Amino acid sequence: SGFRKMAFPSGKVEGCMVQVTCGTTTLNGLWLDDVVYCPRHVICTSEDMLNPNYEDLLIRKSNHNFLVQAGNVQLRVIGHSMQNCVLKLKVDTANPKTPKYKFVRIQPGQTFSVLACYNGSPSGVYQCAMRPNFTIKGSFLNGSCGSVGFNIDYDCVSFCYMHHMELPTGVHAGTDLEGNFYGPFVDRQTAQAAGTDTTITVNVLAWLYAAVINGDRWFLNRFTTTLNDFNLVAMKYNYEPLTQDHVDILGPLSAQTGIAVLDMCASLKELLQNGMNGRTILGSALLEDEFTPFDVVRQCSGVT
């Protein structure tokens, strides 16, 4: 037992990290098969970032201007193209460590692991969720651009995020591996503000089920509620509305614990209205929302 914010083992992704340099700008790239993916702003100077015309800046770049280094060895770039906000650099060598992979575009509320990298070298791994305002709260310093987010289904890595930028409020924005930003963000040094960062209700419920499985049961109340009644309280507290799709996904946790989904909603409603009163749940003094129902099942069952 015990419940931790756990990331996927990062080895399969570490084997894909490379350094990409264009002129004086260096960031990370993801090398899968014979293609290196990286943020297109690798072609920009600090001045270019204020109002970049990427197609125009790219005209001044040839294959030899992109320096790709894997470990301490240079890869030969034989092609390059821009797809949305990412560049795809075709190299002459397939990555021998390419895992089985997919590119997926996730929904808000979904979680993933980030392998933060600098100069193509991994520094650490942590667990994130795509916030309902399409930002992530990561840990990214200058040069972390190009670090990726992913999930693993046994031996298949599903890449869902590539880091591009930090908003003036310190939250993060990036794209899927097709180069499309999550949310309305653009890769430009212009002030962009995030919308309301609401709480991912289905994830808090999943985490309350993890708490019961792990022996933290004090918050269990004697009430039940309905979706409509719960959602009136969710709205007041800036929680995401709960739908029958979320109730369906919590079914296995409801089955394992014998606690009906709506009863757990009623316990959450009381926690929102009464607060924690200085108590903790799974060592947290706030309601955690960065575990999906699948994450809780996975961690409580021991999937490898």
Q: How many CA atoms lie within 13 A of 28 on its CB side?
A: 31
Q: Residue 265 catalytic?
A: no
Q: Does 151 bind a second copy (CB under 8 A)?
A: no
Answer with the entry of ligand KNU, a second copy, none that 303 interacts with (C-beta below 5 to 8 A by kind). Answer: a second copy
What single-letter amino acid sits at 59?
A: I
Residues 86, 128: Cα–Cα separation, whole Å: 21
Size of the site for ligand KNU (CB under 6 A): 10
* Region near a second copy per CB under 8 A, out of 9-17, 85-93, 199-207, 237-245: 9-17
Q: What's the min distance (Å) between Cβ of 138 and ligand KNU?
A: 11
Task: Output b/e per residue, 204-221; b: 16+ Cβ within 10 A.
Answer: bbbbbbbbbbeebeebbe
**DSSP states along 197-219:** --B-HHHHHHHHHHHHHTT--TT
Residues 86-145 that bind ligand KNU (CB under 6 A): 144-145
Token pair listed for 163: 């880091």
We find the least distance from the C-beta atom of residue 134 to ligand KNU, in angstroms, to be: 14
31 touches, from ligand KNU, a second copy, none (C-beta below 5 to 8 Å by class): none
Our finding on whether 192 is near a second copy (CB under 8 A) is no
Footprint on residues 183-202 left by ligand KNU (CB under 6 A): 187-189
If one asks whether residue 273 binds a second copy (CB under 8 A), the answer comes out as no
Question: Which one of 23, 143, 183, 252 is in contact with a second copy (CB under 8 A)?
Answer: 143
Q: Residue 74, interface with a second copy (CB under 8 A)?
A: no
Query: How many Cβ atoms sit within 10 Å of the Cβ of residue 12?
Result: 19
Residue 240 interacts with ligand KNU (CB under 6 A)? Answer: no
Rg of the chain, C-alpha, whole Å: 21
Residue 213 binding a second copy, by CB under 8 A: no
- Which one of the listed residues 38, 41, 44, 85 is annotated catalytic? 41
With CB under 5 to 8 Å by kind, the binding choice for 300 among a second copy, ligand KNU, none is a second copy
DSSP state of 49: G
CB atoms within 10 A of CB 291: 25
If we measure between CA atoms, which residue out of 65, 85, 235, 82 comes closest to residue 146? Answer: 85
Reduced to 3 states (helix: H, G, I; strand: E, B; else coil), residue 83 is strand
Using CA atoms, how far residue 193 sits from 51, 98, 125, 185, 239, in Å, is 17, 37, 27, 9, 20
Q: Which residues in 9-48 contact ligand KNU (CB under 6 A)?
A: 41
276 in contact with a second copy (CB under 8 A): yes
Whose Cβ is closer to a second copy: residue 3's or residue 101's? Answer: 3
> Is residue 168 at the binding interface for a second copy, with CB under 8 A as the rule?
no
Q: Which residues of 40-61 are buried (b: 16+ CB within 10 A; e: fewer)?
A: bbbbbeeebeeebebeebbeeb
Q: Is 44 assigned a catalytic role?
A: no
Name residues contacting ligand KNU, limited to 44-73 (CB under 6 A).
49
CA 264, 273, 244, 253: dihedral to nearest 10 degrees?
-20
Length of the chain measured in residues: 304
176 binds ligand KNU (CB under 6 A): no
- In angstroms, the first-to-last Cα distance of the chain is 16
For binding to ligand KNU (CB under 6 A), which residues are involved?
41, 49, 144-145, 164-166, 187-189
Residues annotated catalytic, as ranges? 41, 145
Q: Which residues bind a second copy (CB under 8 A)?
A: 1-12, 14-15, 115-119, 121-126, 137-144, 166, 170-172, 214-215, 275-276, 278, 280, 283-286, 298-304
